[PDB]
């Protein structure tokens, strides 16, 4: 599914991301925009052979099982395909573990490089929430 901006903002709020670990909704929307352009089905292979999946491009090295990332863990206890669904519950729940692990939203390199410190509230402006 390709979400609209405000549609994903509402979805992320319903699933409890708004101010999760202190990160306002606009940080999460922004991270999704640059990780996946709001497409749940986005996948991208990394150089190390792991793959990033879903609206928040969650990596198979640590977080999910795809059957083809040697030596990896599956900390979210999910197949990586769960992270491609129209229903964002598995991406949200796994993202909540990732953002809790110590480095906050710096786990998403695109969030550090394109969203951190910027006017992230612009991403939810105009939206019914
Ligand atoms: Br939930
Ligand atoms: Br629910
Ligand atoms: Cl947009
Ligand atoms: Cl915000
Ligand atoms: Cl990592
Ligand atoms: Cl393959
Ligand atoms: Cl959903
Ligand atoms: Cl649905
Ligand atoms: Cl933090
Ligand atoms: Cl407005
Ligand atoms: Cl809107
Ligand atoms: Na894995």
Swiss-Prot record:
Entry EC no(s): 3.2.1.17
GO cellular component: cytoplasm; endoplasmic reticulum; extracellular space
Domain C-type lysozyme, residue spans: 1-129
Keywords: Allergen, Antimicrobial, Bacteriolytic enzyme, Disulfide bond, Glycosidase, Hydrolase, Secreted, Signal
Pfam families assigned: Lys
Subcellular location per the Swiss-Prot or TrEMBL entry: Secreted
S-S bridge residues: 6-127, 30-115, 64-80, 76-94
List of residues binding substrate: 101
An example Gene Ontology biological process: defense response to bacterium
Catalytic activity: Hydrolysis of (1->4)-beta-linkages between N-acetylmuramic acid and N-acetyl-D-glucosamine residues in a peptidoglycan and between N-acetyl-D-glucosamine residues in chitodextrins
A single MF term (Gene Ontology): identical protein binding
Gene3D superfamilies with a match to the protein in the record: 1.10.530.10
Annotated catalytic residues: 35, 52
InterPro entries, sorted: Glyco_hydro_22, Glyco_hydro_22_CS, Glyco_hydro_22_lys, Lysozyme-like_dom_sf
Coiled-coil ranges from the UniProt annotation: none
Tissue: In the egg white and polymorphonuclear leukocytes.
Predominant localisation class: secreted
Anything else known: Lysozyme C is capable of both hydrolysis and transglycosylation; it also shows a slight esterase activity. It acts rapidly on both peptide-substituted and unsubstituted peptidoglycan, and slowly on chitin oligosaccharides.
Family: Belongs to the glycosyl hydrolase 22 family.
Role description: Lysozymes have primarily a bacteriolytic function; those in tissues and body fluids are associated with the monocyte-macrophage system and enhance the activity of immunoagents. Has bacteriolytic activity against M.luteus.
Subunit structure: Monomer.
The protein's name in its UniProt record: Lysozyme C
């Amino acid at each position: 599914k390709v979400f609209g901006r405000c549609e994903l903002a509402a979805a992320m709020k319903r699933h409890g991301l708004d101010n999760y670990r202190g990160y306002s909704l606009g940080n999460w929307v922004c991270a999704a925009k640059f990780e996946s352009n709001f497409n749940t089905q986005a996948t991208n292979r990394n150089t190390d052979g792991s793959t990033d999946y879903g609206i928040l491009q969650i990596n198979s090295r640590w977080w999910c099982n795809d059957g083809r990332t040697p030596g990896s863990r599956n900390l979210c206890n999910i197949p990586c395909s769960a992270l491609l669904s129209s229903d964002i519950t598995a991406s949200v729940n796994c993202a909540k573990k990732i953002v809790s692990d110590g480095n906050g939203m710096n786990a998403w390199v695109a969030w550090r490089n394109r969203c951190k410190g910027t006017d992230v509230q612009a991403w939810i402006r105009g939206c019914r929430l």
